Tab-separated table of C-alpha atoms and ligand atoms in Angstrom:
chain	number	residue	atom	x	y	z
A	1	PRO	CA	8.087	40.527	18.553
A	2	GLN	CA	11.158	39.229	16.729
A	3	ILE	CA	14.329	39.996	18.696
A	4	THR	CA	17.724	39.944	17.022
A	5	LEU	CA	20.808	39.290	19.122
A	6	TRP	CA	23.372	41.930	18.136
A	7	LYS	CA	22.525	43.523	21.507
A	8	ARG	CA	21.578	41.988	24.837
A	9	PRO	CA	17.867	40.970	24.784
A	10	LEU	CA	16.930	43.267	27.656
A	11	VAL	CA	13.258	43.880	28.416
A	12	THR	CA	11.254	45.762	31.004
A	13	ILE	CA	9.420	43.465	33.406
A	14	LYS	CA	6.675	44.240	35.912
A	15	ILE	CA	6.837	42.370	39.216
A	16	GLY	CA	5.475	43.152	42.666
A	17	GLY	CA	4.103	46.367	41.191
A	18	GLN	CA	7.559	47.707	40.256
A	19	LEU	CA	9.276	47.874	36.874
A	20	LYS	CA	12.721	46.390	36.302
A	21	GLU	CA	15.078	45.502	33.471
A	22	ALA	CA	15.819	41.837	32.827
A	23	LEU	CA	17.672	39.666	30.331
A	24	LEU	CA	15.852	37.093	28.195
A	25	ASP	CA	18.129	34.135	28.957
A	26	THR	CA	17.477	30.912	27.042
A	27	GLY	CA	20.455	29.295	28.807
A	28	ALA	CA	18.747	29.682	32.189
A	29	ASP	CA	16.381	26.953	33.366
A	30	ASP	CA	15.023	29.294	36.024
A	31	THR	CA	14.324	32.982	36.555
A	32	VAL	CA	16.693	34.726	38.973
A	33	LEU	CA	16.378	38.366	40.043
A	34	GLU	CA	18.698	40.562	42.079
A	35	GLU	CA	17.986	41.237	45.748
A	36	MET	CA	14.538	42.792	46.142
A	37	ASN	CA	11.494	42.760	48.415
A	38	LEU	CA	8.606	40.597	47.207
A	39	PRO	CA	5.322	39.877	49.019
A	40	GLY	CA	4.253	36.411	50.075
A	41	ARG	CA	6.048	33.430	51.532
A	42	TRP	CA	9.319	31.968	50.275
A	43	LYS	CA	11.633	29.035	50.932
A	44	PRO	CA	15.443	28.861	50.774
A	45	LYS	CA	16.881	27.070	47.753
A	46	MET	CA	20.189	26.629	45.929
A	47	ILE	CA	21.002	27.377	42.283
A	48	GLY	CA	24.174	26.805	40.277
A	49	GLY	CA	25.681	28.979	37.572
A	50	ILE	CA	28.914	29.121	35.603
A	51	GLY	CA	30.835	30.003	38.783
A	52	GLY	CA	29.210	27.784	41.413
A	53	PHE	CA	26.122	27.633	43.590
A	54	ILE	CA	24.398	30.448	45.477
A	55	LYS	CA	21.627	30.587	48.063
A	56	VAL	CA	18.377	32.168	46.854
A	57	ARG	CA	14.827	32.793	48.030
A	58	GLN	CA	12.237	30.865	46.020
A	59	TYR	CA	8.887	32.594	45.507
A	60	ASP	CA	6.258	30.435	43.803
A	61	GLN	CA	3.241	31.520	41.748
A	62	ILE	CA	4.495	35.086	41.295
A	63	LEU	CA	2.733	37.262	38.734
A	64	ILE	CA	5.288	38.840	36.388
A	65	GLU	CA	4.678	40.791	33.173
A	66	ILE	CA	7.296	40.657	30.409
A	67	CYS	CA	6.827	43.129	27.546
A	68	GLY	CA	3.115	43.087	28.311
A	69	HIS	CA	2.932	39.276	28.360
A	70	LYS	CA	1.666	37.847	31.645
A	71	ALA	CA	3.298	34.894	33.385
A	72	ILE	CA	2.753	33.242	36.770
A	73	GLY	CA	5.628	31.111	37.978
A	74	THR	CA	8.597	30.625	40.242
A	75	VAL	CA	10.957	33.554	40.780
A	76	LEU	CA	14.294	33.107	42.537
A	77	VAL	CA	15.744	36.113	44.371
A	78	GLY	CA	19.417	36.266	45.238
A	79	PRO	CA	22.911	37.546	44.435
A	80	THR	CA	22.759	37.137	40.677
A	81	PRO	CA	24.907	39.571	38.655
A	82	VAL	CA	21.974	40.159	36.277
A	83	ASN	CA	18.191	39.897	36.368
A	84	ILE	CA	17.566	36.929	34.054
A	85	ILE	CA	14.281	35.592	32.672
A	86	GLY	CA	14.643	31.824	32.350
A	87	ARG	CA	12.838	29.118	30.430
A	88	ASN	CA	10.255	28.559	33.174
A	89	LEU	CA	8.806	31.943	32.172
A	90	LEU	CA	9.952	32.215	28.544
A	91	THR	CA	7.735	29.203	27.808
A	92	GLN	CA	4.732	30.926	29.399
A	93	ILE	CA	5.022	33.890	27.008
A	94	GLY	CA	5.451	31.626	23.957
A	95	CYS	CA	9.113	32.350	23.316
A	96	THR	CA	11.058	30.260	20.801
A	97	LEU	CA	14.433	30.406	19.082
A	98	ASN	CA	14.501	30.444	15.289
A	99	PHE	CA	17.270	30.209	12.701
B	1	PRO	CA	14.597	25.424	12.547
B	2	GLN	CA	12.323	26.490	15.413
B	3	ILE	CA	13.484	25.502	18.902
B	4	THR	CA	10.962	25.627	21.722
B	5	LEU	CA	12.113	26.117	25.301
B	6	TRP	CA	10.305	23.319	27.170
B	7	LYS	CA	13.767	21.769	27.484
B	8	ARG	CA	17.280	23.156	27.308
B	9	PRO	CA	18.006	24.403	23.754
B	10	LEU	CA	20.779	21.862	23.170
B	11	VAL	CA	22.134	21.404	19.640
B	12	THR	CA	25.069	19.658	18.007
B	13	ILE	CA	28.073	21.771	17.030
B	14	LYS	CA	31.371	21.098	15.272
B	15	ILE	CA	34.531	22.824	16.517
B	16	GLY	CA	38.182	21.963	15.998
B	17	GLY	CA	36.982	18.908	14.093
B	18	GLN	CA	34.975	17.497	17.025
B	19	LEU	CA	31.235	17.187	17.563
B	20	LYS	CA	29.769	18.436	20.835
B	21	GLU	CA	26.462	19.421	22.419
B	22	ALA	CA	26.025	23.104	23.233
B	23	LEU	CA	23.415	25.505	24.588
B	24	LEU	CA	21.989	28.253	22.364
B	25	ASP	CA	22.171	30.982	25.001
B	26	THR	CA	20.715	34.433	24.399
B	27	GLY	CA	21.910	35.317	27.908
B	28	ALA	CA	25.597	34.963	26.991
B	29	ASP	CA	27.452	37.775	25.227
B	30	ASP	CA	30.169	35.410	23.978
B	31	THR	CA	30.718	31.695	23.518
B	32	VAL	CA	32.177	29.498	26.275
B	33	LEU	CA	33.190	25.888	25.631
B	34	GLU	CA	34.293	22.999	27.813
B	35	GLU	CA	38.017	22.528	28.319
B	36	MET	CA	39.691	21.395	25.108
B	37	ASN	CA	43.239	21.618	23.761
B	38	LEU	CA	42.734	23.871	20.759
B	39	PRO	CA	45.804	24.944	18.762
B	40	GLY	CA	46.847	28.533	18.215
B	41	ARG	CA	47.490	31.623	20.289
B	42	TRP	CA	45.195	32.533	23.177
B	43	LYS	CA	44.995	34.987	26.058
B	44	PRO	CA	43.770	34.411	29.625
B	45	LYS	CA	40.516	35.886	30.857
B	46	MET	CA	38.046	35.743	33.742
B	47	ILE	CA	34.299	35.503	33.074
B	48	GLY	CA	31.579	35.770	35.688
B	49	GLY	CA	28.018	34.709	36.289
B	50	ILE	CA	25.900	33.175	39.012
B	51	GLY	CA	28.266	31.831	41.655
B	52	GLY	CA	31.356	33.852	40.693
B	53	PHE	CA	34.069	33.627	38.051
B	54	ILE	CA	36.056	30.988	36.198
B	55	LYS	CA	39.364	31.336	34.371
B	56	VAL	CA	39.160	30.725	30.617
B	57	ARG	CA	41.379	30.970	27.544
B	58	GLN	CA	40.236	33.289	24.755
B	59	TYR	CA	40.749	32.069	21.189
B	60	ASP	CA	39.863	34.386	18.307
B	61	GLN	CA	38.534	33.512	14.842
B	62	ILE	CA	37.428	29.967	15.700
B	63	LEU	CA	35.137	28.225	13.217
B	64	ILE	CA	32.028	26.565	14.655
B	65	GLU	CA	29.257	24.872	12.686
B	66	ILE	CA	25.870	25.009	14.433
B	67	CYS	CA	23.175	22.753	12.942
B	68	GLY	CA	24.776	23.156	9.530
B	69	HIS	CA	25.159	26.939	9.880
B	70	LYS	CA	28.855	27.850	9.830
B	71	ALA	CA	30.146	30.610	12.104
B	72	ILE	CA	33.542	32.073	12.999
B	73	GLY	CA	34.374	34.185	16.033
B	74	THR	CA	35.740	34.383	19.555
B	75	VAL	CA	35.536	31.323	21.817
B	76	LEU	CA	36.414	31.081	25.521
B	77	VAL	CA	37.679	27.694	26.721
B	78	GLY	CA	37.668	26.629	30.343
B	79	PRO	CA	35.934	24.645	33.098
B	80	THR	CA	32.364	25.564	32.288
B	81	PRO	CA	29.699	22.980	33.235
B	82	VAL	CA	28.103	23.275	29.769
B	83	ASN	CA	29.034	24.419	26.278
B	84	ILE	CA	27.488	27.842	25.672
B	85	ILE	CA	26.848	29.400	22.260
B	86	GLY	CA	26.593	33.132	22.908
B	87	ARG	CA	25.257	36.053	20.916
B	88	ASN	CA	28.596	36.617	19.169
B	89	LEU	CA	27.910	33.415	17.207
B	90	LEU	CA	24.096	33.270	17.410
B	91	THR	CA	23.907	36.453	15.321
B	92	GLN	CA	26.083	34.852	12.637
B	93	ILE	CA	23.681	31.918	12.182
B	94	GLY	CA	20.677	34.277	11.959
B	95	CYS	CA	19.181	33.242	15.302
B	96	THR	CA	16.347	35.316	16.773
B	97	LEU	CA	13.994	35.242	19.739
B	98	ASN	CA	10.318	35.258	18.800
B	99	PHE	CA	7.187	35.599	20.919
C	1	NJ4	C1	23.807	36.833	32.728
C	1	NJ4	C2	23.868	35.303	32.670
C	1	NJ4	C3	23.869	34.732	34.119
C	1	NJ4	C4	25.155	34.892	31.927
C	1	NJ4	N1	25.260	33.408	31.831
C	1	NJ4	C5	24.511	32.728	30.725
C	1	NJ4	C6	23.302	31.998	31.328
C	1	NJ4	O1	22.435	31.604	30.326
C	1	NJ4	C7	23.766	30.784	32.144
C	1	NJ4	C8	24.369	29.698	31.263
C	1	NJ4	C9	24.629	28.441	32.135
C	1	NJ4	C10	23.723	27.191	31.955
C	1	NJ4	C11	23.967	25.939	32.810
C	1	NJ4	C12	25.115	25.928	33.845
C	1	NJ4	C13	26.019	27.179	34.022
C	1	NJ4	C14	25.774	28.434	33.164
C	1	NJ4	N2	22.596	30.198	32.766
C	1	NJ4	C15	22.341	30.289	34.222
C	1	NJ4	O2	23.124	30.756	34.979
C	1	NJ4	O3	21.085	29.759	34.642
C	1	NJ4	C16	20.895	29.444	36.025
C	1	NJ4	C17	19.326	29.834	36.374
C	1	NJ4	O4	18.615	28.856	35.792
C	1	NJ4	C18	19.512	27.583	35.933
C	1	NJ4	O5	19.586	26.957	34.844
C	1	NJ4	C19	21.139	26.976	34.329
C	1	NJ4	C20	21.882	27.367	35.349
C	1	NJ4	C21	20.967	28.139	36.264
C	1	NJ4	S1	26.806	32.729	32.212
C	1	NJ4	O6	26.833	31.292	31.960
C	1	NJ4	O7	27.143	32.895	33.623
C	1	NJ4	C22	28.045	33.615	31.159
C	1	NJ4	C23	28.936	34.671	31.832
C	1	NJ4	C24	29.961	35.428	30.989
C	1	NJ4	C25	30.075	35.116	29.500
C	1	NJ4	C26	31.111	35.889	28.635
C	1	NJ4	C27	32.016	34.875	27.932
C	1	NJ4	O8	30.385	36.633	27.719
C	1	NJ4	C28	29.168	34.058	28.821
C	1	NJ4	C29	28.140	33.301	29.661
């Protein structure tokens, strides 16, 4: 679809069999989700935001559905204030900015 | 134009008479710019994201040109690692997400 930006671009995502709300975040290189339980193995990693760096759990090759569009990529899980869908997954669903 | 998301959506902007590079960020409600000594009245504010908060100065009715599209609105100035064009200005330049 075409999404205007007078409101937050929030979408329902499907991950690990559970639905969640997440923000389509073109300023995020990576996808970062709030604390949750995901199956499979993970490795500790660091990510930086506007306020500094946080420790996260990196799950690779995770199946995630975004507005019915399927993606398989890295998902970082940690103390983010907001579930954000970053460019690593926005590219998989064919997302672009237009003006 | 159409901006794909393989790389960071960086564009050239003009603010306070200076050219800068900034991120077109659908994940940001408002616009945050690197420290700069803008004239006029401002008020202090704290803004938060991954890693915590930073202190910024809020200027209102600031003119920014974004790839030739003029816009005027609120701008936060402080020690952000990158210039961030948020939805408050993205709407004004007719920017949409499309997939
Ligand atoms: C909800 C999101 C978290 C909000 N944020 C915008 C995101 O798009 C940030 C933008 C950004 C890009 C690069 C360095 C630091 C911050 N991206 C980001 O955290 O992504 C991380 C994951 O992927 C990696 O790549 C990038 C950095 C890593 S915010 O910046 O915290 C922000 C907070 C308050 C306001 C008020 C004024 O409205 C405006 C903006």
